[PDB]
PDB file of N, CA and C in Angstrom:
ATOM      1  N   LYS A  52     170.586 218.788  21.061  1.00  0.00           N
ATOM      2  CA  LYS A  52     170.907 220.140  21.061  1.00  0.00           C
ATOM      3  C   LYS A  52     171.814 220.305  22.288  1.00  0.00           C
ATOM      4  N   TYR A  53     171.358 219.793  22.902  1.00  0.00           N
ATOM      5  CA  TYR A  53     172.737 220.845  24.616  1.00  0.00           C
ATOM      6  C   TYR A  53     172.857 219.149  25.366  1.00  0.00           C
ATOM      7  N   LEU A  54     173.071 218.410  24.619  1.00  0.00           N
ATOM      8  CA  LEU A  54     174.160 217.119  25.103  1.00  0.00           C
ATOM      9  C   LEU A  54     175.289 217.076  24.529  1.00  0.00           C
ATOM     10  N   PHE A  55     176.846 216.604  25.377  1.00  0.00           N
ATOM     11  CA  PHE A  55     177.931 216.690  25.391  1.00  0.00           C
ATOM     12  C   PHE A  55     178.102 215.949  24.471  1.00  0.00           C
ATOM     13  N   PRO A  56     179.260 216.478  23.399  1.00  0.00           N
ATOM     14  CA  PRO A  56     179.133 215.029  22.755  1.00  0.00           C
ATOM     15  C   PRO A  56     179.678 213.799  23.595  1.00  0.00           C
ATOM     16  N   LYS A  57     179.907 212.337  22.567  1.00  0.00           N
ATOM     17  CA  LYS A  57     180.379 211.472  23.051  1.00  0.00           C
ATOM     18  C   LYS A  57     180.847 211.397  22.105  1.00  0.00           C
ATOM     19  N   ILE A  58     182.060 209.193  22.856  1.00  0.00           N
ATOM     20  CA  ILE A  58     183.559 209.420  21.948  1.00  0.00           C
ATOM     21  C   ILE A  58     182.255 208.030  21.404  1.00  0.00           C
ATOM     22  N   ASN A  59     182.411 207.488  20.517  1.00  0.00           N
ATOM     23  CA  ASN A  59     181.831 206.232  20.347  1.00  0.00           C
ATOM     24  C   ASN A  59     183.132 205.547  20.017  1.00  0.00           C
ATOM     25  N   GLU A  60     184.523 205.273  20.564  1.00  0.00           N
ATOM     26  CA  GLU A  60     184.992 204.744  20.129  1.00  0.00           C
ATOM     27  C   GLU A  60     186.587 205.098  20.174  1.00  0.00           C
ATOM     28  N   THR A  61     187.549 204.574  21.259  1.00  0.00           N
ATOM     29  CA  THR A  61     188.752 205.111  21.364  1.00  0.00           C
ATOM     30  C   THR A  61     189.590 204.294  20.416  1.00  0.00           C
ATOM     31  N   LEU A  62     190.669 204.109  19.755  1.00  0.00           N
ATOM     32  CA  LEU A  62     191.936 203.030  19.374  1.00  0.00           C
ATOM     33  C   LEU A  62     192.722 203.696  19.340  1.00  0.00           C
ATOM     34  N   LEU A  63     193.404 202.411  20.369  1.00  0.00           N
ATOM     35  CA  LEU A  63     194.877 202.372  20.326  1.00  0.00           C
ATOM     36  C   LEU A  63     195.100 201.633  19.323  1.00  0.00           C
ATOM     37  N   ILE A  64     196.117 202.320  18.128  1.00  0.00           N
ATOM     38  CA  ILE A  64     196.671 201.605  17.637  1.00  0.00           C
ATOM     39  C   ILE A  64     198.613 201.187  17.314  1.00  0.00           C
ATOM     40  N   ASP A  65     198.346 200.435  17.333  1.00  0.00           N
ATOM     41  CA  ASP A  65     199.436 199.481  18.184  1.00  0.00           C
ATOM     42  C   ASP A  65     200.369 198.478  16.631  1.00  0.00           C
ATOM     43  N   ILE A  66     201.097 199.299  17.152  1.00  0.00           N
ATOM     44  CA  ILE A  66     202.239 198.169  15.902  1.00  0.00           C
ATOM     45  C   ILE A  66     203.352 197.519  16.125  1.00  0.00           C
ATOM     46  N   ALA A  67     202.826 196.266  16.180  1.00  0.00           N
ATOM     47  CA  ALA A  67     203.984 195.393  16.197  1.00  0.00           C
ATOM     48  C   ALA A  67     205.694 195.542  15.813  1.00  0.00           C
ATOM     49  N   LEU A  68     206.708 196.411  15.648  1.00  0.00           N
ATOM     50  CA  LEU A  68     207.214 197.085  14.776  1.00  0.00           C
ATOM     51  C   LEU A  68     208.841 195.297  15.066  1.00  0.00           C
ATOM     52  N   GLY A  69     208.901 195.275  13.423  1.00  0.00           N
ATOM     53  CA  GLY A  69     210.202 194.430  13.731  1.00  0.00           C
ATOM     54  C   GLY A  69     211.317 193.927  14.230  1.00  0.00           C
ATOM     55  N   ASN A  70     212.095 193.378  14.435  1.00  0.00           N
ATOM     56  CA  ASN A  70     213.528 193.722  14.303  1.00  0.00           C
ATOM     57  C   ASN A  70     214.016 191.995  13.407  1.00  0.00           C
ATOM     58  N   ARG A  71     214.024 192.949  12.127  1.00  0.00           N
ATOM     59  CA  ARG A  71     214.786 191.692  10.609  1.00  0.00           C
ATOM     60  C   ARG A  71     215.709 190.774  11.132  1.00  0.00           C
ATOM     61  N   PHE A  72     216.538 191.074  11.855  1.00  0.00           N
ATOM     62  CA  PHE A  72     217.512 190.580  11.820  1.00  0.00           C
ATOM     63  C   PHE A  72     217.690 189.667  13.728  1.00  0.00           C
ATOM     64  N   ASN A  73     216.676 189.438  14.049  1.00  0.00           N
ATOM     65  CA  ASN A  73     216.028 188.411  15.616  1.00  0.00           C
ATOM     66  C   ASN A  73     216.591 187.261  15.079  1.00  0.00           C
ATOM     67  N   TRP A  74     216.788 186.203  14.277  1.00  0.00           N
ATOM     68  CA  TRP A  74     216.515 185.858  14.051  1.00  0.00           C
ATOM     69  C   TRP A  74     217.857 184.594  14.610  1.00  0.00           C
ATOM     70  N   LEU A  75     219.211 186.097  14.073  1.00  0.00           N
ATOM     71  CA  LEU A  75     220.715 185.820  13.989  1.00  0.00           C
ATOM     72  C   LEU A  75     221.492 185.410  15.521  1.00  0.00           C
ATOM     73  N   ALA A  76     219.839 186.112  17.150  1.00  0.00           N
ATOM     74  CA  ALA A  76     220.542 186.125  17.495  1.00  0.00           C
ATOM     75  C   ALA A  76     220.575 185.056  19.054  1.00  0.00           C
ATOM     76  N   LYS A  77     222.103 185.408  18.862  1.00  0.00           N
ATOM     77  CA  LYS A  77     221.815 184.082  19.654  1.00  0.00           C
ATOM     78  C   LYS A  77     222.198 184.730  21.755  1.00  0.00           C
ATOM     79  N   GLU A  78     221.627 183.935  22.367  1.00  0.00           N
ATOM     80  CA  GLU A  78     221.212 184.707  24.127  1.00  0.00           C
ATOM     81  C   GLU A  78     222.714 183.814  24.662  1.00  0.00           C
ATOM     82  N   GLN A  79     223.669 184.527  25.498  1.00  0.00           N
ATOM     83  CA  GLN A  79     225.015 184.598  26.376  1.00  0.00           C
ATOM     84  C   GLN A  79     223.732 184.601  27.291  1.00  0.00           C
ATOM     85  N   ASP A  80     225.348 184.499  28.587  1.00  0.00           N
ATOM     86  CA  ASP A  80     225.172 184.701  29.942  1.00  0.00           C
ATOM     87  C   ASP A  80     224.518 185.722  30.637  1.00  0.00           C
ATOM     88  N   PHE A  81     226.100 187.145  29.623  1.00  0.00           N
ATOM     89  CA  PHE A  81     226.625 187.911  30.123  1.00  0.00           C
ATOM     90  C   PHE A  81     227.145 188.148  31.348  1.00  0.00           C
ATOM     91  N   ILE A  82     228.122 187.451  31.497  1.00  0.00           N
ATOM     92  CA  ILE A  82     229.500 187.111  31.956  1.00  0.00           C
ATOM     93  C   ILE A  82     230.999 187.331  31.795  1.00  0.00           C
ATOM     94  N   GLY A  83     231.664 188.744  32.089  1.00  0.00           N
ATOM     95  CA  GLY A  83     233.046 187.868  31.648  1.00  0.00           C
ATOM     96  C   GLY A  83     231.806 189.509  30.330  1.00  0.00           C
ATOM     97  N   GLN A  84     233.856 189.667  29.443  1.00  0.00           N
ATOM     98  CA  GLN A  84     233.773 191.156  28.489  1.00  0.00           C
ATOM     99  C   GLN A  84     234.533 190.389  27.280  1.00  0.00           C
ATOM    100  N   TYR A  85     234.481 189.028  27.019  1.00  0.00           N
ATOM    101  CA  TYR A  85     235.240 190.535  26.118  1.00  0.00           C
ATOM    102  C   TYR A  85     235.012 188.164  25.062  1.00  0.00           C
ATOM    103  N   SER A  86     234.537 188.163  23.778  1.00  0.00           N
ATOM    104  CA  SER A  86     234.303 187.479  23.258  1.00  0.00           C
ATOM    105  C   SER A  86     235.254 187.128  22.265  1.00  0.00           C
ATOM    106  N   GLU A  87     235.590 185.860  21.769  1.00  0.00           N
ATOM    107  CA  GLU A  87     237.268 186.024  21.275  1.00  0.00           C
ATOM    108  C   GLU A  87     236.430 184.617  20.054  1.00  0.00           C
ATOM    109  N   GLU A  88     237.271 183.900  19.168  1.00  0.00           N
ATOM    110  CA  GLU A  88     237.315 182.705  18.297  1.00  0.00           C
ATOM    111  C   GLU A  88     238.022 182.508  17.525  1.00  0.00           C
ATOM    112  N   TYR A  89     237.746 181.675  16.587  1.00  0.00           N
ATOM    113  CA  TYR A  89     239.399 181.469  15.865  1.00  0.00           C
ATOM    114  C   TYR A  89     238.770 179.980  14.988  1.00  0.00           C
ATOM    115  N   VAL A  90     239.319 179.428  14.089  1.00  0.00           N
ATOM    116  CA  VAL A  90     239.866 179.070  12.474  1.00  0.00           C
ATOM    117  C   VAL A  90     241.037 177.960  13.006  1.00  0.00           C
ATOM    118  N   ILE A  91     240.874 176.632  11.709  1.00  0.00           N
ATOM    119  CA  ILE A  91     241.789 176.116  12.018  1.00  0.00           C
ATOM    120  C   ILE A  91     242.725 176.207  11.000  1.00  0.00           C
ATOM    121  N   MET A  92     243.820 176.819  10.333  1.00  0.00           N
ATOM    122  CA  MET A  92     244.356 177.034   9.221  1.00  0.00           C
ATOM    123  C   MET A  92     244.373 176.202   7.885  1.00  0.00           C
ATOM    124  N   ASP A  93     244.769 175.714   6.627  1.00  0.00           N
ATOM    125  CA  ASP A  93     244.260 175.056   5.227  1.00  0.00           C
ATOM    126  C   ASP A  93     245.886 174.337   5.671  1.00  0.00           C
ATOM    127  N   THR A  94     245.977 172.898   5.859  1.00  0.00           N
ATOM    128  CA  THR A  94     246.903 172.378   5.772  1.00  0.00           C
ATOM    129  C   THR A  94     246.575 171.156   4.012  1.00  0.00           C
ATOM    130  N   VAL A  95     246.951 171.384   3.362  1.00  0.00           N
ATOM    131  CA  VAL A  95     246.202 170.247   2.230  1.00  0.00           C
ATOM    132  C   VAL A  95     246.963 168.942   2.347  1.00  0.00           C
ATOM    133  N   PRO A  96     246.013 168.338   1.290  1.00  0.00           N
ATOM    134  CA  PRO A  96     246.388 166.362   1.299  1.00  0.00           C
ATOM    135  C   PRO A  96     247.371 166.419   0.315  1.00  0.00           C
ATOM    136  N   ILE A  97     248.950 166.192   0.747  1.00  0.00           N
ATOM    137  CA  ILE A  97     250.178 165.553  -0.124  1.00  0.00           C
ATOM    138  C   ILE A  97     249.950 164.390  -0.016  1.00  0.00           C
ATOM    139  N   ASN A  98     250.211 164.129  -1.152  1.00  0.00           N
ATOM    140  CA  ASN A  98     251.083 163.069  -1.952  1.00  0.00           C
ATOM    141  C   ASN A  98     252.164 161.803  -1.072  1.00  0.00           C
ATOM    142  N   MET A  99     251.971 160.784  -1.049  1.00  0.00           N
ATOM    143  CA  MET A  99     252.990 160.252  -0.232  1.00  0.00           C
ATOM    144  C   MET A  99     253.246 159.254  -0.700  1.00  0.00           C
ATOM    145  N   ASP A 100     255.409 159.016  -0.370  1.00  0.00           N
ATOM    146  CA  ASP A 100     256.198 158.990  -1.189  1.00  0.00           C
ATOM    147  C   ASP A 100     257.289 158.320  -0.004  1.00  0.00           C
ATOM    148  N   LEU A 101     257.909 155.978  -0.645  1.00  0.00           N
ATOM    149  CA  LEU A 101     258.100 155.323   0.092  1.00  0.00           C
ATOM    150  C   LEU A 101     259.394 155.436  -0.412  1.00  0.00           C
ATOM    151  N   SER A 102     260.282 156.403  -0.594  1.00  0.00           N
ATOM    152  CA  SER A 102     261.873 156.793  -0.381  1.00  0.00           C
ATOM    153  C   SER A 102     262.285 158.043   0.138  1.00  0.00           C
TER     154      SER A 102
ATOM    155  N   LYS B  52     147.869 177.948 -36.599  1.00  0.00           N
ATOM    156  CA  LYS B  52     147.720 179.878 -36.848  1.00  0.00           C
ATOM    157  C   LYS B  52     147.215 180.270 -36.363  1.00  0.00           C
ATOM    158  N   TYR B  53     146.456 180.043 -35.186  1.00  0.00           N
ATOM    159  CA  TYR B  53     145.456 181.055 -34.436  1.00  0.00           C
ATOM    160  C   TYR B  53     145.225 180.967 -32.770  1.00  0.00           C
ATOM    161  N   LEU B  54     146.913 180.435 -32.390  1.00  0.00           N
ATOM    162  CA  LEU B  54     146.451 179.959 -31.397  1.00  0.00           C
ATOM    163  C   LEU B  54     147.345 181.752 -30.417  1.00  0.00           C
ATOM    164  N   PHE B  55     147.154 181.570 -28.987  1.00  0.00           N
ATOM    165  CA  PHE B  55     148.108 182.791 -28.439  1.00  0.00           C
ATOM    166  C   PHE B  55     150.265 182.607 -28.546  1.00  0.00           C
ATOM    167  N   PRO B  56     150.765 183.377 -28.242  1.00  0.00           N
ATOM    168  CA  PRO B  56     152.466 183.313 -28.708  1.00  0.00           C
ATOM    169  C   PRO B  56     152.507 182.996 -27.350  1.00  0.00           C
ATOM    170  N   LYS B  57     153.539 181.582 -26.983  1.00  0.00           N
ATOM    171  CA  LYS B  57     153.240 181.286 -25.346  1.00  0.00           C
ATOM    172  C   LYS B  57     154.241 181.380 -25.106  1.00  0.00           C
ATOM    173  N   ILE B  58     155.409 181.519 -23.880  1.00  0.00           N
ATOM    174  CA  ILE B  58     156.801 181.719 -23.415  1.00  0.00           C
ATOM    175  C   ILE B  58     157.134 180.583 -22.360  1.00  0.00           C
ATOM    176  N   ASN B  59     158.405 180.138 -23.326  1.00  0.00           N
ATOM    177  CA  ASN B  59     159.527 179.231 -23.063  1.00  0.00           C
ATOM    178  C   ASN B  59     159.379 179.135 -21.245  1.00  0.00           C
ATOM    179  N   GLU B  60     160.127 180.680 -21.076  1.00  0.00           N
ATOM    180  CA  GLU B  60     160.337 181.291 -19.671  1.00  0.00           C
ATOM    181  C   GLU B  60     160.660 182.823 -19.914  1.00  0.00           C
ATOM    182  N   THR B  61     161.338 182.358 -18.439  1.00  0.00           N
ATOM    183  CA  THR B  61     161.021 183.949 -18.018  1.00  0.00           C
ATOM    184  C   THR B  61     161.955 184.086 -16.874  1.00  0.00           C
ATOM    185  N   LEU B  62     163.549 184.704 -17.755  1.00  0.00           N
ATOM    186  CA  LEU B  62     164.929 185.032 -16.871  1.00  0.00           C
ATOM    187  C   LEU B  62     164.487 185.742 -15.897  1.00  0.00           C
ATOM    188  N   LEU B  63     164.888 186.178 -14.404  1.00  0.00           N
ATOM    189  CA  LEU B  63     165.725 186.561 -13.938  1.00  0.00           C
ATOM    190  C   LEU B  63     167.278 187.157 -14.081  1.00  0.00           C
ATOM    191  N   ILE B  64     167.849 187.136 -15.084  1.00  0.00           N
ATOM    192  CA  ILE B  64     169.306 187.768 -14.739  1.00  0.00           C
ATOM    193  C   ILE B  64     169.598 188.543 -13.447  1.00  0.00           C
ATOM    194  N   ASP B  65     170.574 187.962 -12.641  1.00  0.00           N
ATOM    195  CA  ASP B  65     170.516 188.815 -11.014  1.00  0.00           C
ATOM    196  C   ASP B  65     172.039 188.286 -10.682  1.00  0.00           C
ATOM    197  N   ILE B  66     173.138 189.281 -10.771  1.00  0.00           N
ATOM    198  CA  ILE B  66     174.038 189.602 -10.611  1.00  0.00           C
ATOM    199  C   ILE B  66     174.558 190.402  -9.441  1.00  0.00           C
ATOM    200  N   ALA B  67     175.230 188.767  -8.825  1.00  0.00           N
ATOM    201  CA  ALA B  67     176.093 190.027  -7.746  1.00  0.00           C
ATOM    202  C   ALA B  67     176.536 190.481  -7.652  1.00  0.00           C
ATOM    203  N   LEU B  68     176.732 192.077  -7.450  1.00  0.00           N
ATOM    204  CA  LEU B  68     177.702 193.106  -6.995  1.00  0.00           C
ATOM    205  C   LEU B  68     178.635 192.822  -5.935  1.00  0.00           C
ATOM    206  N   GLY B  69     179.438 193.272  -6.385  1.00  0.00           N
ATOM    207  CA  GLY B  69     179.941 193.113  -4.611  1.00  0.00           C
ATOM    208  C   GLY B  69     181.047 194.234  -4.535  1.00  0.00           C
ATOM    209  N   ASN B  70     180.706 194.176  -3.019  1.00  0.00           N
ATOM    210  CA  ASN B  70     181.905 195.125  -2.736  1.00  0.00           C
ATOM    211  C   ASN B  70     184.045 195.139  -2.311  1.00  0.00           C
ATOM    212  N   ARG B  71     184.691 195.468  -2.860  1.00  0.00           N
ATOM    213  CA  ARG B  71     185.359 195.077  -2.500  1.00  0.00           C
ATOM    214  C   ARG B  71     186.039 195.451  -1.282  1.00  0.00           C
ATOM    215  N   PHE B  72     186.102 195.715  -0.831  1.00  0.00           N
ATOM    216  CA  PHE B  72     186.802 196.380   0.324  1.00  0.00           C
ATOM    217  C   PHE B  72     185.681 196.202   1.845  1.00  0.00           C
ATOM    218  N   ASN B  73     184.487 195.030   1.479  1.00  0.00           N
ATOM    219  CA  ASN B  73     183.733 194.570   2.468  1.00  0.00           C
ATOM    220  C   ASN B  73     184.236 193.620   4.050  1.00  0.00           C
ATOM    221  N   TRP B  74     186.401 193.185   2.892  1.00  0.00           N
ATOM    222  CA  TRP B  74     186.589 192.327   4.421  1.00  0.00           C
ATOM    223  C   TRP B  74     187.303 193.452   5.195  1.00  0.00           C
ATOM    224  N   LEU B  75     187.496 194.904   4.506  1.00  0.00           N
ATOM    225  CA  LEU B  75     187.842 196.317   5.872  1.00  0.00           C
ATOM    226  C   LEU B  75     187.128 196.297   7.114  1.00  0.00           C
ATOM    227  N   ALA B  76     185.593 195.853   6.371  1.00  0.00           N
ATOM    228  CA  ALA B  76     184.382 196.414   7.240  1.00  0.00           C
ATOM    229  C   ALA B  76     184.503 195.855   8.671  1.00  0.00           C
ATOM    230  N   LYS B  77     184.855 196.375   9.773  1.00  0.00           N
ATOM    231  CA  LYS B  77     184.158 196.522  11.047  1.00  0.00           C
ATOM    232  C   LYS B  77     183.521 196.311  11.209  1.00  0.00           C
ATOM    233  N   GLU B  78     182.376 196.061  12.447  1.00  0.00           N
ATOM    234  CA  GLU B  78     180.899 196.861  12.934  1.00  0.00           C
ATOM    235  C   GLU B  78     180.819 197.038  14.307  1.00  0.00           C
ATOM    236  N   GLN B  79     179.960 197.959  14.846  1.00  0.00           N
ATOM    237  CA  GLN B  79     180.568 198.792  15.828  1.00  0.00           C
ATOM    238  C   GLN B  79     179.263 198.842  16.255  1.00  0.00           C
ATOM    239  N   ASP B  80     178.581 199.971  17.009  1.00  0.00           N
ATOM    240  CA  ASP B  80     176.962 199.638  17.366  1.00  0.00           C
ATOM    241  C   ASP B  80     176.192 200.358  16.987  1.00  0.00           C
ATOM    242  N   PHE B  81     176.817 201.867  16.545  1.00  0.00           N
ATOM    243  CA  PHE B  81     176.371 202.735  16.273  1.00  0.00           C
ATOM    244  C   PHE B  81     175.563 203.279  17.624  1.00  0.00           C
ATOM    245  N   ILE B  82     176.764 204.626  18.540  1.00  0.00           N
ATOM    246  CA  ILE B  82     176.111 204.686  19.532  1.00  0.00           C
ATOM    247  C   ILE B  82     177.818 205.980  19.884  1.00  0.00           C
ATOM    248  N   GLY B  83     176.441 206.855  20.244  1.00  0.00           N
ATOM    249  CA  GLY B  83     177.920 207.923  20.479  1.00  0.00           C
ATOM    250  C   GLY B  83     178.415 208.280  18.007  1.00  0.00           C
ATOM    251  N   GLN B  84     179.055 209.238  18.791  1.00  0.00           N
ATOM    252  CA  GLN B  84     179.564 209.892  17.197  1.00  0.00           C
ATOM    253  C   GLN B  84     180.210 210.098  16.842  1.00  0.00           C
ATOM    254  N   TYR B  85     181.761 210.207  17.693  1.00  0.00           N
ATOM    255  CA  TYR B  85     182.738 210.131  17.011  1.00  0.00           C
ATOM    256  C   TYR B  85     183.990 209.124  17.979  1.00  0.00           C
ATOM    257  N   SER B  86     184.242 209.083  17.074  1.00  0.00           N
ATOM    258  CA  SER B  86     185.854 208.138  16.830  1.00  0.00           C
ATOM    259  C   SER B  86     186.746 208.718  17.444  1.00  0.00           C
ATOM    260  N   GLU B  87     187.752 208.297  18.029  1.00  0.00           N
ATOM    261  CA  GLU B  87     188.947 208.788  17.796  1.00  0.00           C
ATOM    262  C   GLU B  87     190.595 208.094  17.784  1.00  0.00           C
ATOM    263  N   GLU B  88     191.111 207.967  17.688  1.00  0.00           N
ATOM    264  CA  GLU B  88     192.451 206.410  17.689  1.00  0.00           C
ATOM    265  C   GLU B  88     193.528 207.435  17.913  1.00  0.00           C
ATOM    266  N   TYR B  89     194.738 206.892  18.574  1.00  0.00           N
ATOM    267  CA  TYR B  89     195.967 207.255  18.589  1.00  0.00           C
ATOM    268  C   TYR B  89     197.159 206.464  19.304  1.00  0.00           C
ATOM    269  N   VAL B  90     198.721 206.711  18.661  1.00  0.00           N
ATOM    270  CA  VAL B  90     199.695 206.404  18.884  1.00  0.00           C
ATOM    271  C   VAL B  90     200.826 206.089  19.939  1.00  0.00           C
ATOM    272  N   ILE B  91     202.079 205.667  20.309  1.00  0.00           N
ATOM    273  CA  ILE B  91     202.518 206.384  21.114  1.00  0.00           C
ATOM    274  C   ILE B  91     203.703 206.901  20.672  1.00  0.00           C
ATOM    275  N   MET B  92     204.284 208.167  20.241  1.00  0.00           N
ATOM    276  CA  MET B  92     205.301 207.846  19.846  1.00  0.00           C
ATOM    277  C   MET B  92     206.860 207.506  20.513  1.00  0.00           C
ATOM    278  N   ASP B  93     207.611 207.570  19.716  1.00  0.00           N
ATOM    279  CA  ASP B  93     208.848 206.907  19.660  1.00  0.00           C
ATOM    280  C   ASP B  93     209.870 207.741  20.697  1.00  0.00           C
ATOM    281  N   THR B  94     210.210 206.194  21.584  1.00  0.00           N
ATOM    282  CA  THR B  94     211.714 207.072  22.349  1.00  0.00           C
ATOM    283  C   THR B  94     212.339 206.593  22.256  1.00  0.00           C
ATOM    284  N   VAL B  95     213.933 206.817  21.791  1.00  0.00           N
ATOM    285  CA  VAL B  95     214.551 205.490  21.379  1.00  0.00           C
ATOM    286  C   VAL B  95     215.535 204.852  22.471  1.00  0.00           C
ATOM    287  N   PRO B  96     215.877 203.627  22.419  1.00  0.00           N
ATOM    288  CA  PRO B  96     216.486 203.468  23.749  1.00  0.00           C
ATOM    289  C   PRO B  96     218.003 204.276  23.996  1.00  0.00           C
ATOM    290  N   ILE B  97     218.490 204.592  25.095  1.00  0.00           N
ATOM    291  CA  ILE B  97     219.605 204.722  25.082  1.00  0.00           C
ATOM    292  C   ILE B  97     220.860 204.748  25.728  1.00  0.00           C
ATOM    293  N   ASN B  98     221.758 204.564  25.489  1.00  0.00           N
ATOM    294  CA  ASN B  98     222.899 204.291  25.850  1.00  0.00           C
ATOM    295  C   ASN B  98     223.756 204.418  28.124  1.00  0.00           C
ATOM    296  N   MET B  99     223.281 203.756  28.067  1.00  0.00           N
ATOM    297  CA  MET B  99     223.251 203.994  30.077  1.00  0.00           C
ATOM    298  C   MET B  99     224.745 204.470  30.832  1.00  0.00           C
ATOM    299  N   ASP B 100     225.171 205.385  31.016  1.00  0.00           N
ATOM    300  CA  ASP B 100     226.263 205.225  31.724  1.00  0.00           C
ATOM    301  C   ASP B 100     226.142 205.477  33.640  1.00  0.00           C
ATOM    302  N   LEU B 101     226.902 204.956  34.517  1.00  0.00           N
ATOM    303  CA  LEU B 101     227.003 205.014  35.354  1.00  0.00           C
ATOM    304  C   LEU B 101     228.010 205.941  36.201  1.00  0.00           C
ATOM    305  N   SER B 102     227.790 207.400  35.184  1.00  0.00           N
ATOM    306  CA  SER B 102     228.488 208.187  36.138  1.00  0.00           C
ATOM    307  C   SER B 102     227.062 209.216  36.294  1.00  0.00           C
TER     308      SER B 102
END
């Protein structure tokens, strides 16, 4: 009854918190500051006539 | 009709009773008496400003 209380273990609980959208993340080169994007608009195929 | 009755078999029914939480059981060394645990509290990432 005269000893100092001693620790069995000390346990770092480290939970790996994850970003669910990480598989979308592209990686750039961090150069310039404006990203732009563009598409090509539809031109529907037309019938041909020989007249 | 004058013989003593004789045993065909005697059958020890031994059912293996299982602890369903046994896969959680860590094993320590039984040394000391206080287990403690700790986490690291959140510090949210902050924007940087050059001023």
